[PDB]
């Protein structure tokens, strides 16, 4: 349906919220977290 | 017929992500390639693995053995019609052609199944063919084959109270959902923990128990949780041989907070090298974290994170930014605070949102009724 | 279509846009942006410099007024950058000022410089104390002190009356 | 040429007629409800 | 062997649809049209879909006494253009069946739009619409016989004014057609309201945000609301155009509700990217709010080739990276300048700071100033007091600065419990509900 | 309070530990359970509504 302007113009995908939350935040998810308890 | 072959799928996953060993794909993959007449498991791994030093000749003898099997099949197709019986062509080639499916992934499958499906004198004759699709649908994560054969099993294989290979259907759907994004289907359909007792997906029955606990720690409310994985004595043995699993369970019911990260680290490192868990291994972490933090917020309204710090071991700024991200997720409402530093919880969802949900339906719901009352007079 | 390069265009649009923001017309600011999307990409630097100023006022400027007044020293923009120094605001005077906060000097607000001449004394006593009734900012109201009643329970009761009327009109 | 097309505009008027006829039918409904 | 089938069913197109429309339009007023006469939209878009052809149905049109049975059957039988589109006037002037004038001045003429030769017949379509606009003008000077142009041919007329649009666009713009439109408005203002003005007003905004910019303020004095919104499609994209306006008028909190409304009033299908491409620039206003969720709840993978900038852009929104900011700008700023996107590049930083202050504000009762100066990529404590005042900027949640040295003495705000604010609004909630009861009353009034 | 309950919310600074709730509120619950299926009916009828016309 040509609306007179617009003709001119769950695999891995629900997780995308968690992943874009976790892009540069806890990128390993455990490999610091399992090793936090001996930092202090 | 399928236990080392599902172990080949385990090896597909096992040399999918890591490269810490570049010679398992010769050790137990050539040990697989010499058994089961595994031809395609090296013929497709011939490109994604190494140069395969000279791996044609020791495989020439086995593709020649396959040629012997195939040529006695090609004689058998007219040797069985001289046998004056019913469908002995179909029998005598369906046997070694399901074996061709055991040899080759799709070719023996396609050349077999569209002939040996032509008469269906039993739903086993359908469902063994369905199984021989389900093996390759676990090997190659298909969708069309290994949901439409389940549609066919949900066409006529409802009949017959045989219950073994009808619970197999439940197990395969549980495996298929937990193979993608499952919350509840694997818990509901892995209810049948004890009552399976032998399969090929049961190549380690105790790992099936790991599967049902790794989904029933998510999809299961705490009364249901104690009723299933505590008041289940029939599951108590196979969780009882697994220490850290049972440790995480009885601590998670016990609210033993400082071992939660230990046990979660155990389960997460197990999550690394176990297949059908690549869409899951990062989601599961925060899932079980916020799942413990549910009753951790149910605990108090008067709460500091120093108490949380010596409840966890290190969480001060870690859990500050972490619970900040959980609030940013929308769930877990509490006011973490600067120097006053009182983690204050709320009251449940009665107040006005119980009032509000009805018209939150009747915004778009009633837009549906508005515009579809505007359907009548153009 | 054959209008040649008129170099007065850049700074006359600059003065237009300058006073246009000085009278707080951001809708008119962006209608100016949208009537010329072409030259305002990289050229027209005396429009491209007011849109860096729009980044600075996108930031909600009190520091960046001085931090952008640093780089307009001589173009005879003076009459209208004076109106920009007028249109710098007074919300901190509307929250905590009015004879004492010792000085609010370290935020680059143009008015809030000049420690105590009669210029900012006049401004701290300008036309009163911008809030109005019942309180000063010597001891702040923290907004305005409305906090009236639930007398509007009675006019929502009036809403109930004509609501029942509209029920009767509906049946 | 005002006094030509107002007559046409008098069919907005006629919309009240259909509603009139149909609520007369609505009364005719209740007429044998009350007779029952 | 296929073309003898539209000789049957393309004949029965005009037989059933057009014959029933004209004959049932000759009486039974306002059931004259609009029960299958304005099946016109999809049955005649379908006529331009369902099926030499160009001269055949345009010869020998106006004959006599109503022998269109034989004449349309001649149009059937003849399957085995310079005066030709004017031949419905060149056989004789039409002289009878004034509901058929625009009908046969639309349905045979318009398939050249779908034939797409664009060179010799768009000026002939211009002439054919000079004839049809002569009908449009001469309906009130020479046709003082009955209504026949409101009740049927106004709903036909707005459609063929969209076809006017389809013709006028493919070569140039239109300016005379705008005063011509407002004359069409004056002969539809007080007598019988048509959309019409809203059709070429959608086109007005559509070509004007390309090329003229004074006219939103002229809409402001021109906002005859037209609450009929019968199609809801024209009204939907009307909200889309004016939501692009309020996005370029920088009105955002209105834009989110009115553009979510404009989306949820699209019942549309055909996932080529109509709803998707309109919806992307719709929720650009949510990119301008300062708040936007993850767009996984919005994507159709047919839009994926166009949103190859957009997902990384909303990643830049949820993050605050200036590298990602400028990189998405220069690299991935293509294909959106055709729609107009560069008003988010000035205030993507504002989006960053409002997302951050939303997270921190609902996260923290009290925060400190010289650590909220280091939550995000802030600059200084004077920049942080600055951005606390700019974080209020409208009336946000209580943040009093502890005005000695305690940085901020902010706390959370209360009294949304269940007390007076919901029952302050429930009068208006049930005001909306009684408006729907008025919709029930008019549901009874539909017969 | 954690695992089990008698709905005693932590009332640290009062001196009673008030044990209170109103479990019958279920008119609102029941109306929600109505709406969920009322428009399942309406959506099932919409097939007839948008089918028998065109």
UniProtKB/Swiss-Prot annotation, chain B:
PROSITE patterns named in the record: PCI (PS50250)
SUPFAM superfamilies recorded: TPR-like (SSF48452), Winged helix' DNA-binding domain (SSF46785)
A single GO BP: proteasome-mediated ubiquitin-dependent protein catabolic process
Signal peptide annotation: none
GO CC annotation: cytosol; extracellular region; ficolin-1-rich granule lumen; nucleoplasm; proteasome accessory complex; proteasome complex; proteasome regulatory particle; secretory granule lumen
Protein keywords: Proteasome
InterPro entries, alphabetized: PCI_dom (IPR000717), Rpn7/CSN1 (IPR019585), Rpn7_N (IPR045135), RPN7_PSMD6_C (IPR049549), TPR-like_helical_dom_sf (IPR011990), WH_DNA-bd_sf (IPR036390)
Pfam family, one: RPN7
Domain called PCI: residue spans: 182-350
The family this protein is said to belong to: Belongs to the proteasome subunit S10 family.
Job of this protein: Component of the 26S proteasome, a multiprotein complex involved in the ATP-dependent degradation of ubiquitinated proteins. This complex plays a key role in the maintenance of protein homeostasis by removing misfolded or damaged proteins, which could impair cellular functions, and by removing proteins whose functions are no longer required. Therefore, the proteasome participates in numerous cellular processes, including cell cycle progression, apoptosis, or DNA damage repair.
Name under which the protein is recorded: 26S proteasome non-ATPase regulatory subunit 6
Organism ancestry: Eukaryota, Metazoa, Chordata, Craniata, Vertebrata
Curated annotation (Swiss-Prot), chain C:
GO biological process per UniProt: proteasome-mediated ubiquitin-dependent protein catabolic process
Transport among keywords: no
Keyword Nucleus recorded: no
One GO location term (cellular component): proteasome regulatory particle, lid subcomplex
Domain PCI: start-end pairs: 1-152
Domain of life: Eukaryota
Alphabetic keyword roster: Isopeptide bond, Phosphoprotein, Proteasome, Ubl conjugation
Cross-link (Glycyl lysine isopeptide (Lys-Gly) (interchain with G-Cter in SUMO2)): 118
Function: Component of the 26S proteasome, a multiprotein complex involved in the ATP-dependent degradation of ubiquitinated proteins. This complex plays a key role in the maintenance of protein homeostasis by removing misfolded or damaged proteins, which could impair cellular functions, and by removing proteins whose functions are no longer required. Therefore, the proteasome participates in numerous cellular processes, including cell cycle progression, apoptosis, or DNA damage repair.
Protein family according to the UniProt entry: Belongs to the proteasome subunit S14 family.
Quaternary structure, from the entry: Component of the 19S proteasome regulatory particle complex. The 26S proteasome consists of a 20S core particle (CP) and two 19S regulatory subunits (RP). The regulatory particle is made of a lid composed of 9 subunits including PSMD8, a base containing 6 ATPases and few additional components. Interacts with DDI2. Interacts with TASOR.
Protein name per its UniProtKB record: 26S proteasome non-ATPase regulatory subunit 8
Record organism: Homo sapiens
Source organism phylogeny: Eukaryota, Metazoa, Chordata, Craniata, Vertebrata
Gene this protein is translated from: PSMD8
UniProtKB/Swiss-Prot annotation, chain D:
Domain of life: Eukaryota
Localization per Swiss-Prot or TrEMBL: Cytoplasm; Nucleus
Entry's family note: Belongs to the AAA ATPase family.
Subunit record text: Component of the 19S proteasome regulatory particle complex. The 26S proteasome consists of a 20S core particle (CP) and two 19S regulatory subunits (RP). The regulatory particle is made of a lid composed of 9 subunits, a base containing 6 ATPases including PSMC5 and few additional components. Component of a complex with USP49 and RUVBL1. Interacts with PRPF19. Interacts with TRIM5. Interacts with NDC80. Interacts with PAAF1. Interacts, in vitro, with the thyroid hormone receptor (in a thyroid hormone T3-dependent manner) and with retinoid X receptor (RXR). Interacts with ERCC6.
Stated role: Component of the 26S proteasome, a multiprotein complex involved in the ATP-dependent degradation of ubiquitinated proteins. This complex plays a key role in the maintenance of protein homeostasis by removing misfolded or damaged proteins, which could impair cellular functions, and by removing proteins whose functions are no longer required. Therefore, the proteasome participates in numerous cellular processes, including cell cycle progression, apoptosis, or DNA damage repair.
Name used for this protein in its record: 26S proteasome regulatory subunit 8
UniProt source species: Homo sapiens
Lineage: Eukaryota, Metazoa, Chordata, Craniata, Vertebrata
Full-sequence portion shown in this chain: 24 to 59 of 406
From Swiss-Prot, chain E:
UniProt crosslink position (Glycyl lysine isopeptide (Lys-Gly) (interchain with G-Cter in SUMO2)): 12
Region annotated Disordered, chain positions: 1-43
Residues joined by cross-link Glycyl lysine isopeptide (Lys-Gly) (interchain with G-Cter in SUMO1): 12
Top-level taxon in the UniProt lineage: Eukaryota
Xref: Pfam families: PCI, Rpn3_C
Any single biological process term in GO: ubiquitin-dependent protein catabolic process
Residue stretches spanning the membrane: none
InterPro entries in UniProt: 26S_Psome_reg_C, CSN3, PCI_dom, TPR-like_helical_dom_sf, WH_DNA-bd_sf
Domain annotation PCI: ranges: 236-415
GO cellular component, one term: nucleus
Matching PROSITE patterns: PCI
Modified residues (Phosphoserine): 368, 380
Keyword field: Isopeptide bond, Phosphoprotein, Proteasome, Ubl conjugation
Molecular function terms, GO-annotated: enzyme regulator activity
Complexes and interactors: Component of the 19S proteasome regulatory particle complex. The 26S proteasome consists of a 20S core particle (CP) and two 19S regulatory subunits (RP). The regulatory particle is made of a lid composed of 9 subunits including PSMD3, a base containing 6 ATPases and few additional components. Interacts with UBQLN1 (via ubiquitin-like domain). Interacts with ERCC6.
Protein's job: Component of the 26S proteasome, a multiprotein complex involved in the ATP-dependent degradation of ubiquitinated proteins. This complex plays a key role in the maintenance of protein homeostasis by removing misfolded or damaged proteins, which could impair cellular functions, and by removing proteins whose functions are no longer required. Therefore, the proteasome participates in numerous cellular processes, including cell cycle progression, apoptosis, or DNA damage repair.
Family: Belongs to the proteasome subunit S3 family.
Protein name: 26S proteasome non-ATPase regulatory subunit 3
Organism: Homo sapiens (Human)
